[PDB]
Design a protein around this ligand. Sequence first.
Ligand code: NA
Ligand code: NA
Ligand code: NA
Ligand code: NA
Ligand code: ZN
Ligand code: ZN
Lengths: 277, 278
Amino acid sequence: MKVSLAGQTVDVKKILNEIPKRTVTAALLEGGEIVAVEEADDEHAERKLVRRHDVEGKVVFVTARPCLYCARELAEAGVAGVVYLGRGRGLGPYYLARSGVEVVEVHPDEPLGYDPVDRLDVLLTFGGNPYLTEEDVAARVYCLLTGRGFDADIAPAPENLSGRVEIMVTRGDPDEAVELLKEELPVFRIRRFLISGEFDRDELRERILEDIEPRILDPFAVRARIARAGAFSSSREAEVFIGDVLTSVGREVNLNDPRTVVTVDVLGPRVSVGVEK
Amino acid sequence: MKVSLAGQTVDVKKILNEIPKRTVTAALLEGGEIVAVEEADDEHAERKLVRRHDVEGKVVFVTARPCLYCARELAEAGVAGVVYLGRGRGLGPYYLARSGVEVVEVHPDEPLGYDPVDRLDVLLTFGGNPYLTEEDVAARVYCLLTGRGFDADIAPAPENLSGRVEIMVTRGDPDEAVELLKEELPVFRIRRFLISGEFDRDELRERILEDIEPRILDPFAVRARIARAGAFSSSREAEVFIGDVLTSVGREVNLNDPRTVVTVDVLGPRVSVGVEKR
Ligand code: NA
Ligand code: NA
Ligand code: NA
Ligand code: NA
Ligand SMILES: [Zn+2]
Ligand SMILES: [Zn+2]
């Protein structure tokens, strides 16, 4: 759906699926295209946007309802329009409508299209609860991690994949985090990954030998999940490959009762692997 | 300011200006220009629209936030998009959005502005985060519940308080409702309160002794949260008061390793009390 306001037309799905959504985010639009983006940290997204860029005459897209202080700054800075998602306690829209600024609250009937994290430190998996959403689970997760002093990029339903929430820990220890999460999200599958990136086959071999093999207790078994085919095309293709690297080094495999399981996740070009005992 | 949804483009000021505003009004759009219009009487505007006209695949413009009953009927009749003015308590938009209907609020006037419920049977909370909004959680909770024959009265973000959704069960058994909420939404904090009202401290003491004390397993602790001060000024003031009522009659505090936690919520005049094991 598209909104026409203040001299430009903004297409909602495009902008959504094009800005980061790790936290509340503000994007500055000109001619309908994004010329700036800021993400909330201690500072609100809108405030960073206004002081770090020139917003006058333009349209701002925000991923939540702007708080009052921000609406004031946006209006005073001379923004002409604001398009926002209908989330949050913020009252700034009502102040904006009374300040000459065109404002619209959109509710897409489709998933937002979150991005998969660049480094899948922790993967969370859950099923069969029709009323629960990835965003609910990501909400809890976000609350716990930040609550405990952690910094993380959290991605619910990346690529609109259901049952999934992905975590990348940028500050603090990933294994402290899974411990936390295991404790609170009892019925969810939590998985730690020791390496995760877009690797050549050669690069992936070197990485497995470096960070995965030494952690192995024989016998092992490789279990691969293909969330999106790319670097590998089937579970067995990746199992055989990773298995061979190790088995030729030379570790022992036993698929029936291994002491260590080597986990692999594949999302398109992204390969992640960890070990569980 | 025009809006393009469900294939149409609607010129907001033009439409707005063609519709009567005596009461909440709904207008059926094509092109999109108005082709039908119905006004609220004893019946909601949207209900008359669906009931009196063919809305399938069309777009509807409503002069307030549609309620959940209206959203259900709009959706389950094939509406494809809904534009509405930003006033009223209606939650239907959130229902619509999760039913494949595109929806937009224009001319945001005033917030939902929900009141705290009269009797807090069930409180569903969650913390600060950028993924969730209270009215969506409540719309979903409302479908869950009504889906199983419960009836309730729901208040997302009363007084615009964050991460908070209040439930007064009005048909079916509250505890069964909390059982259901805990299975089907296991990731939220969900508390049942056995008593909830506006009391003088004497009435509160009585209520505590009748409904709370008999279900305690020693030892206990009291953990209260003040959403807004009133009947009690602070957590400790509430905990001290309720602690003494319970000790004064033989119960025993531990506060280190309680076998029972006595929960309290304070919101202005309204105190609610519950009991949790372990
Ligand atoms: Na995207
Ligand atoms: Na630890
Ligand atoms: Na621990
Ligand atoms: Na709660
Ligand atoms: Zn703000
Ligand atoms: Zn209605």
